[PDB]
């Protein structure tokens, strides 16, 4: 409002915390692995 | 013919909104429309609400969520039991409380301090 | 419910035979029980539909307390009315007067639902700016730390002979 | 919700609720004929409860802070937010480019001696 313009500014969503499974009365558990070059090994184990 | 475009748009809008209901797809399942070749040709076609241009008229999330399960055709042979449709329904509402359960903990965190 | 067949085979075709996208609706939208048209007024004011006993000065905390103040003395006055003549005609005038008092207090307090969104949309995104920043001097502390690696390797380059 | 404005609403709601309950208990039971004990001990309990809720109303009315700040000041606060966040992209991408031309050179400075030792064999 109040005559503000429309421009293209970057807004990043709060992707610091993710949700997978909900326990009883809340209190979920937080699991990003964020692995290193060990991920290269898994794609070759299926090879 | 502007009548055909608008009327079909809102008819097809509510169809995926009706498809957002998990028990409605259960109602497809005892009706056995999951294996109909015209409907599997239709439900592969139905996947065009994923773009945000058509999604500004779309209002609820799990319409697109459970439609993609139907695309694999593995999910379509089940759901004849109402217990797995209820399990999908129960887990969806067990995670619709996410923002509520997130907000109450931060409210508890601020009230504790 | 109903099944649709008119346009399902329209869009499984070849070329531009599937229908083009509809234009942006700049008119009445018929979604649901509401209308939800464009450029609507956000809220109706207290001026229409509600009799007004407060002036335009709007002492918001004092309008909160005077309405609390006037209701309590009118409730004691109504108790005295019920003590003296509860079967009077003047009861519903008294009942709608305090109801008039209760309308004004409720509309004034709720003004921070769009106002709260402006602080919070700000405050997290200087942290990612900070995270963009604290990785920025991370980059010169990394790039000049390997130039000095190049420098000592070049300094040891002839000395290794 | 769940701010101190909400607990003021239910406190004055329960105060009006405990008024009619105290009135309701005082009219449903009492001394039948004496020309009692459970009614009065309810009455002292009800008179105490309406007093503490009236006490907490004054406590919480004074406890609530006054209305603060304006949306227009925060509207101007977003105006400086956008210009610094645009240039932060430019300030980040420039040292990225310093990394880009440096890595392109040294990966070639990796490469030119990388295949050089192949033909050494």
Swiss-Prot record, chain A:
Function: Component of the Mediator complex, a coactivator involved in the regulated transcription of nearly all RNA polymerase II-dependent genes. Mediator functions as a bridge to convey information from gene-specific regulatory proteins to the basal RNA polymerase II transcription machinery. Mediator is recruited to promoters by direct interactions with regulatory proteins and serves as a scaffold for the assembly of a functional preinitiation complex with RNA polymerase II and the general transcription factors.
Record's subcellular location: Nucleus
The protein's name: Mediator of RNA polymerase II transcription subunit 17
Family: Belongs to the Mediator complex subunit 17 family.
Disease implication from the record: Microcephaly, postnatal progressive, with seizures and brain atrophy: A disorder characterized by postnatal progressive microcephaly and severe developmental retardation associated with cerebral and cerebellar atrophy. Infants manifest swallowing difficulties leading to failure to thrive, jitteriness, poor visual fixation, truncal arching, seizures. There is no acquisition of developmental milestones and patients suffer from marked spasticity and profound retardation. Progressive microcephaly becomes evident few months after birth.
Organism: Homo sapiens (Human)
Residues represented out of the complete protein: 1 to 47 of 651
Tissue: Ubiquitous.
Swiss-Prot record, chain B:
Keywords recorded for this protein, A-Z: Acetylation, Activator, Nucleus, Transcription, Transcription regulation
Localization annotation: Nucleus
A GO MF term: transcription coregulator activity
One of the protein's GO biological processes: RNA polymerase II preinitiation complex assembly
InterPro entries documented for this protein: Med31_sf, Mediator_Med31
Recorded family membership: Belongs to the Mediator complex subunit 31 family.
General function of this protein: Component of the Mediator complex, a coactivator involved in the regulated transcription of nearly all RNA polymerase II-dependent genes. Mediator functions as a bridge to convey information from gene-specific regulatory proteins to the basal RNA polymerase II transcription machinery. Mediator is recruited to promoters by direct interactions with regulatory proteins and serves as a scaffold for the assembly of a functional preinitiation complex with RNA polymerase II and the general transcription factors.
Subunit structure: Component of the Mediator complex, which is composed of MED1, MED4, MED6, MED7, MED8, MED9, MED10, MED11, MED12, MED13, MED13L, MED14, MED15, MED16, MED17, MED18, MED19, MED20, MED21, MED22, MED23, MED24, MED25, MED26, MED27, MED29, MED30, MED31, CCNC, CDK8 and CDC2L6/CDK11. The MED12, MED13, CCNC and CDK8 subunits form a distinct module termed the CDK8 module. Mediator containing the CDK8 module is less active than Mediator lacking this module in supporting transcriptional activation.
Swiss-Prot record, chain C:
Keyword Phosphoprotein: yes
Domain of life: Eukaryota
Keyword Transport: no
GO molecular function (one): transcription coactivator activity
Keywords (A to Z) from UniProt: Activator, Isopeptide bond, Nucleus, Phosphoprotein, Transcription, Transcription regulation, Ubl conjugation
GO biological process: positive regulation of transcription elongation by RNA polymerase II; positive regulation of transcription initiation by RNA polymerase II; protein ubiquitination; regulation of transcription by RNA polymerase II; RNA polymerase II preinitiation complex assembly; somatic stem cell population maintenance; transcription initiation at RNA polymerase II promoter
GO cellular component: core mediator complex; mediator complex; nuclear body; nucleoplasm; nucleus; transcription regulator complex; ubiquitin ligase complex
PTM comment text: Constitutively sumoylated.
Main localization category: nucleus
Subcellular location: Nucleus
Oligomeric and partner information: Component of the Mediator complex, which is composed of MED1, MED4, MED6, MED7, MED8, MED9, MED10, MED11, MED12, MED13, MED13L, MED14, MED15, MED16, MED17, MED18, MED19, MED20, MED21, MED22, MED23, MED24, MED25, MED26, MED27, MED29, MED30, MED31, CCNC, CDK8 and CDC2L6/CDK11. The MED12, MED13, CCNC and CDK8 subunits form a distinct module termed the CDK8 module. Mediator containing the CDK8 module is less active than Mediator lacking this module in supporting transcriptional activation.
Assigned protein family: Belongs to the Mediator complex subunit 7 family.
Organism whose genome encodes this protein: Homo sapiens
UniProtKB/Swiss-Prot annotation, chain D:
Presence of the UniProt keyword Transcription regulation in the record: yes
Name the record gives this protein: Mediator of RNA polymerase II transcription subunit 21
Gene name for this UniProt entry: MED21
One MF annotation (Gene Ontology) recorded for this entry: ubiquitin protein ligase activity
Record's subunit section: Interacts with PPARG. Component of the Mediator complex, which is composed of MED1, MED4, MED6, MED7, MED8, MED9, MED10, MED11, MED12, MED13, MED13L, MED14, MED15, MED16, MED17, MED18, MED19, MED20, MED21, MED22, MED23, MED24, MED25, MED26, MED27, MED29, MED30, MED31, CCNC, CDK8 and CDC2L6/CDK11. The MED12, MED13, CCNC and CDK8 subunits form a distinct module termed the CDK8 module. Mediator containing the CDK8 module is less active than Mediator lacking this module in supporting transcriptional activation.
Gene3D superfamilies in UniProt: Mediator complex, subunit Med21 (6.10.280.10)
Keywords recorded for this protein, A-Z: Activator, Nucleus, Transcription, Transcription regulation
Known function: Component of the Mediator complex, a coactivator involved in the regulated transcription of nearly all RNA polymerase II-dependent genes. Mediator functions as a bridge to convey information from gene-specific regulatory proteins to the basal RNA polymerase II transcription machinery. Mediator is recruited to promoters by direct interactions with regulatory proteins and serves as a scaffold for the assembly of a functional preinitiation complex with RNA polymerase II and the general transcription factors.
Pfam families per UniProt: Med21
Organism: Homo sapiens (Human)
């Amino acid at each position: 409002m109040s005559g503000v313009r429309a421009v293209r500014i970057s807004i990043e969503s709060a992707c610091e915390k993710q949700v997978h499974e909900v326990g009883l009365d809340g209190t979920e558990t937080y699991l990003p692995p964020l692995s290193m070059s060990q991920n290269l090994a898994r794609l070759a184990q299926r090879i | 013919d502007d009548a055909g475009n608008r009327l079909r748009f809102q008819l097809e809008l509510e169809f995926v909104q009706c498809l957002a209901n998990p028990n409605y797809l259960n109602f497809l399942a005892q009706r056995g429309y999951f294996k109909d070749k015209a409907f599997v040709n239709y439900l592969k076609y139905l996947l065009y609400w994923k773009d945000p241009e058509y999604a500004k008229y779309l209002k609820y999330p799990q319409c697109l969520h459970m439609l993609e399960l139907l695309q694999y055709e593995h999910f379509r042979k089940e759901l004849v039991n109402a217990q797995c449709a209820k399990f999908i329904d129960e887990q969806q509402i067990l995670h619709w409380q996410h923002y509520s359960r997130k907000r109450m903990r931060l409210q508890q965190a601020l009230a504790e301090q | 419910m109903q099944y649709i067949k008119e346009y399902t085979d329209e869009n499984i075709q070849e070329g531009l035979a599937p229908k083009p996208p509809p234009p942006i609706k700049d008119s009445y939208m018929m979604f649901g029980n509401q209308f939800q048209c464009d450029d609507l007024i956000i809220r109706p004011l207290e001026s229409q539909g509600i009799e007004r006993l407060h002036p335009m000065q709007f002492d918001h905390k004092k309008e909160l307390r005077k309405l609390n103040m006037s209701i309590l003395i009118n409730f004691l006055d109504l108790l005295d009315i019920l003590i003296r003549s509860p079967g009077s005609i003047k009861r519903e005038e008294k009942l709608e007067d305090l109801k008039l008092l209760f309308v004004h207090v409720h509309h004034l307090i709720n003004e921070y639902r769009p106002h709260q969104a402006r602080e919070t949309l700000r405050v997290m995104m200087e942290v990612q700016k900070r995270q963009r920043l604290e990785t920025a001097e991370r980059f010169q502390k990394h790039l000049e730390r390997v130039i000095e690696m190049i420098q000592n390797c070049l300094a040891s380059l002839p000395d290794d002979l | 919700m769940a701010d101190r404005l909400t607990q003021l609403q239910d406190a004055v709601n329960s105060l009006a609720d405990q008024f009619c309950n105290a009135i309701g208990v005082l009219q449903q039971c009492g001394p039948p004929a004496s020309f009692a004990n459970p009614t009065e001990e309810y009455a002292q309990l009800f008179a105490a409860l309406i007093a503490r809720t009236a006490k907490d109303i004054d406590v919480l009315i004074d406890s609530l802070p006054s209305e603060e700040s304006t949306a227009a000041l925060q509207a101007a606060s977003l105006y400086k937010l956008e210009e610094e966040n645009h240039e932060a992209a430019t300030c980040l991408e420039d040292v990225v480019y310093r990394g880009d031309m440096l890595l392109e050179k040294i990966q070639s400075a990796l490469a030119d001696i990388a295949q050089s030792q192949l033909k050494t064999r």
